[PDB]
Amino acid sequence: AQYEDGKQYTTLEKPVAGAPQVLEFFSFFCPHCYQFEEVLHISDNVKKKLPEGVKMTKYHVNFMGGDLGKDLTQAWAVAMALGVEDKVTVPLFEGVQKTQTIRSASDIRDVFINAGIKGEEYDAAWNSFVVKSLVAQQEKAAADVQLRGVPAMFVNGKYQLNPQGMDTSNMDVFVQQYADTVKYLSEK
Ligand SMILES: O=C(O)Cc1coc2cc(Oc3ccccc3)ccc12
C-alpha cells in the first residue's frame, strides 16, 4: 500500500480509548519541535487538512530538561488554562533554545509578563489546582504510550506518525506528507 505500517506511521500495540482525535507532544527543549513551530508550522498545516472543528490537543512533556522541563510542563498548563498558548509558544522556544535566557521558573514567568499576562493572574494559575490537574492530564497522556521521543503525534489514540519515513530534502514536501498522513489516519 501507499501508506504502510512502519513507513509513514506505526500502530500502537495497546490502543488508548478516549484520546483526542489529534494529540501532539512536544518539549520546549526539543530541536525538531522548535522547527515544527517556527519553520514548518506543522499544527496549522495539519489543521488545514482536517475537517472544520476537529479537536487538536498539544501537551508538553517532562523528560527533557530536568527541573526546568517539569517547570515548563506546569507553565504550559498555565498557558492552556489562560488560553495564551499562541502568545507564549515562540518566546518560550526562543528563550530555551535560541537566547538561552530561560534558566529558572522566574525566567519562565518573565516570558508571560512580557507577553502581557498579569503577574497576579500568572501566579494564581501557577498555584491553582486546575493547573495541577492539567499537569496530571499531560503526564497521563504521555504515560499511556511510554513516550520517549518528541515531536510526536497520535491519531484517534491508535496511530503514531513516523516522520523518520518522510522526505526531508524539501521542507514543504515533508509538511505535506505529514499532514496528508494525519488526514489518511483520521479517515481510518
Ligand atoms: O527524528 C527524525 O528523523 C524525525 C523528524 C522529526 O521531526 C523532523 C523534522 C525535520 O526537519 C526537516 C528539515 C528539512 C526538511 C524537512 C524537514 C527532519 C526530521 C524530523
Numbering used by the authors: 1 to 188
What does the paper say about this structure?
The highly oxidising protein DsbA catalyses disulfide bond formation between two cysteine residues of unfolded substrates in the periplasm of Gram-negative bacteria. The structure of DsbA is comprised of a thioredoxin domain with an inserted helical domain. Like many other thiol-disulfide oxidoreductase enzymes, the active site of DsbA is comprised of the characteristic CXXC motif (Cys30–Pro31–His32–Cys33 in Escherichia coli DsbA) and a highly conserved cis-proline in an adjacent loop which has been shown to play a key role in the binding of substrates. Adjacent to the active site is a hydrophobic groove which serves as a site for both DsbB and unfolded substrates to form a complex.
Phenyl ether 25 bound to the EcDsbA groove neighbouring the active site showing a binding pose to the benzyl ether 23 and the direct anilino analogue 15. The co-structure was more comparable with the direct anilino analogue 15. The phenoxy group of 25 occupied the hydrophobic end of the binding groove with the oxygen atom of the ether linker at a distance of 4.1 Å from Gln35. The side chain of Gln35 is conformationally flexible in the crystal structure and therefore unlikely to form a hydrogen bond with 25. The carboxyl group of 25 is positioned more closely to the imidazole side chain of His32 (N–O distance = 3.7Å) compared to that of 15 (N–O distance = 4.5Å) and possibly formed a weak polar interaction. The strongest binding affinities were observed for 6-phenoxy 25 and 6-benzyl 28 with KD values of 326 ± 25 µM and 341 ± 47 µM, respectively. The similar binding affinities observed for 25 and 28 suggested that the oxygen atom of the ether linker does not contribute to the interaction, which is consistent with what we observed in the co-crystal structures. LE values showed 6-phenoxy 25 and 6-benzyl 28 were the most efficient binders.
